[PDB]
Symmetry: D2
Subunit: 230 residues, 4 copies
């Protein structure tokens, strides 16, 4: 699967759910209006990405990169915020997934499937119980990230995320290039065959809360996956 949005236009290639909307300048707004309380937005590439193949046991490798900005509104504290994720094709927004559950986790499940790279702007009770405030986490089947690094969340600042999944070694690795010329990285060993079905969606889920809220605006997104085949 190969795609490249250098901007977003309604062209039938994406699937919006909840409060995700294409605002002009070709911005993917998640949510379109953060003043609405407790938004949940999904923005999925419109066809399934094969990530593994039953006949071969082969797993896909992929890279995706996206540039985005999270932004305060106006004196509200920021939440919740925005993820890139793989979920079973057929999954809708889960129940009991609002706010700090990022539109990807119910909350009560268990049970609960999903690989995510989260850009978490709000410290919940389960969050890197560090004094991390904002953080970049990798989630596997849990809102409690299996790894996470501090994120100097800067309102309106361009963040450039690159995520590589290497099927050979089963590593998901993330790098986020900040406007200040620094990078943050975090990685996690995940075998996609162990935790997800052979076809998933890829794309974003973003939430906000009330009074807590922020913009999650995605400016570009490229994605390349390859499943061998045999």
């Amino acid at each position: 699967v190969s795609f490249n949005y250098t901007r977003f236009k309604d062209d039938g290639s994406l699937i919006f759910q909840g409060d995700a909307k294409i605002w002009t300048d070709g911005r993917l707004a998640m949510p379109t209006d953060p003043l609405v309380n407790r938004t949940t937005s999904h923005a999925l590439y419109a066809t399934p990405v094969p990530i593994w193949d039953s006949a071969t046991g082969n797993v896909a490798s992929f890279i995706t990169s996206f540039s985005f900005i999270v932004s305060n509104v106006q004196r509200y504290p920021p939440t919740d915020g925005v993820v890139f994720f793989l979920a079973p094709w057929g999954t809708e927004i889960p129940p009991n997934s609002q706010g700090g559950y990022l539109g990807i986790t119910d909350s009560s499940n268990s049970q609960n499937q999903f690989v995510a790279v989260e850009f978490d702007s709000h410290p919940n009770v389960w969050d890197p119980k560090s004094l991390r405030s904002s953080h970049i986490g990798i989630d596997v089947n849990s809102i409690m990230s299996l790894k996470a690094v501090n994120w100097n969340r800067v309102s309106g600042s361009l963040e450039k995320a690159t995520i590589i999944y290497d099927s050979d070694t089963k590593i998901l690795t993330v790098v986020m290039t900040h406007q200040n010329g620094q990078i943050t990285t975090i990685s996690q060993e995940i075998d996609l065959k162990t935790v997800l079905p052979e076809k998933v969606s890829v794309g974003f889920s973003a939430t906000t809360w009330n009074p807590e809220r922020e913009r999650h605006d995605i400016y570009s997104w490229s994605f390349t996956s390859t499943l061998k085949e045999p």
Copy 2:
């Protein structure tokens, strides 16, 4: 922390919860009596194990070995498994953790936080949809193993586990030497410091169901952890 049980005595050094009992000949029985119905058994080292140190940021390495056997009773089908696990101190047998949730996962949560190596004798819907029947799995925060290998579960047969956590690369590795002299291995990169508090319990959880059950008898357990205070 360093201990070595060549057999088990009820000497205050372990905490037994639920159906865990010392049974004949210093065998740690989990459960003592599988005829009972659905059993959940915890046997934990009775002192919290320091796995990382907040001051220095150092993380413990460890090596642990245990030998055990799982046995059929009677003509019942086998379930559910026995796991070695680390969890935050204050860990109690969670609610909703019967059967396939192996006494460590609250099926109606979401907030499950533990690291386990599972010896899982019954394929649940969330189990490796490889065709694995029995399997050895590594779990973090989820009953869906991040990695797993299959297990030739042989009733009555001695299994010899060795698990190495290497804090330098943050890999948990498991080898199982089977009665036939073969070994099974599985590993997972896990940053202990990111998924668990400074002090954890180490020990075992095992469940049985109804009608599915089996014995899980632990014969020996040694553990060495070293945490750099510089």
Copy 3:
């Protein structure tokens, strides 16, 4: 360290050694002229890169991206490849590094010290005796790759490489997105602080042989690294 060459200017930001030169249309040619016969070319970022810090024991994370094309000349078979590499600052083109040694390995040593991602166009004796012909490899201290993946080398075809080093888990991961919309990835655990000194060059090395040769023309290159000071 942060830089981003959308093309290459003769601007003192790089060090060129051997046959490396800025060539037509702002491209980095390695070598500038393959017709010559055997070439070795180095093009290094001209400032040492700090990749670990003595006081904290911290290791740098980085992400680097570069677009490049390798091209046949015109009937010769291709050799030898181009690499992205880290080497001890003060690196010169090593003795005995011609041809398949990629300008990074002194073949009569032993003391070779470097981390490289190679795009190797020619199967030498030590190359994946898979039947791989061209391959993308991760090299540490040796010309024999620790991990390699097969590479559909297409003459004149644009390749877009991304390499992420995550200091958290110590994993170097490569993605190369090919013109056909496929990607190849390869990944390797590498502790930069075990294998390299605290200041390194980043850059490229490329060689051609006689008769075997090809162009390696790099079009763009961005690099962001972050080393923590506390």
Copy 4:
């Protein structure tokens, strides 16, 4: 391949090269006579170990333990080390492999093919630039350890090593339990299939120098490998 030496007898099960001999009480002495200057000793299991299989592409897993003591020679500084290593079946002590090269590396090459866990008693210039004196390293195709931890080398003190190779994740993990009951660990991702042929030796190499020397006495050694032939 499975074996277990609780002591070493002259039973033709191993292959001894250079100064490896069975010494008093079935100790494997490497060198037998540390008064000799610049000793090299190999002690290999005398049957190849299949570590991977061409037809299926599967890699073996293995677990191995051995206990050994390194001991000073009075008035002499200690060198150089003892290593557990895998090398192509048919491997011979390399030329130019004395002293710091541990009988595994030809210091004038290239091209050295092996995987080793070294117990290195003599800090060479290429040794971990940590301040380590003695250290336990993982070596792939280089004398310069891909990873290392430091070793509190104590003359005459029992060391208990456990090494697991997990073919699933491709990770070599070492634990070493010291006489004081602390453990040291170190791991490295190495896909044996990328670096070694199908059949390998497993065993030990040890060197001394002049005037530096020490005994490397091995007391016990067990090994279990399993290679999936489907």
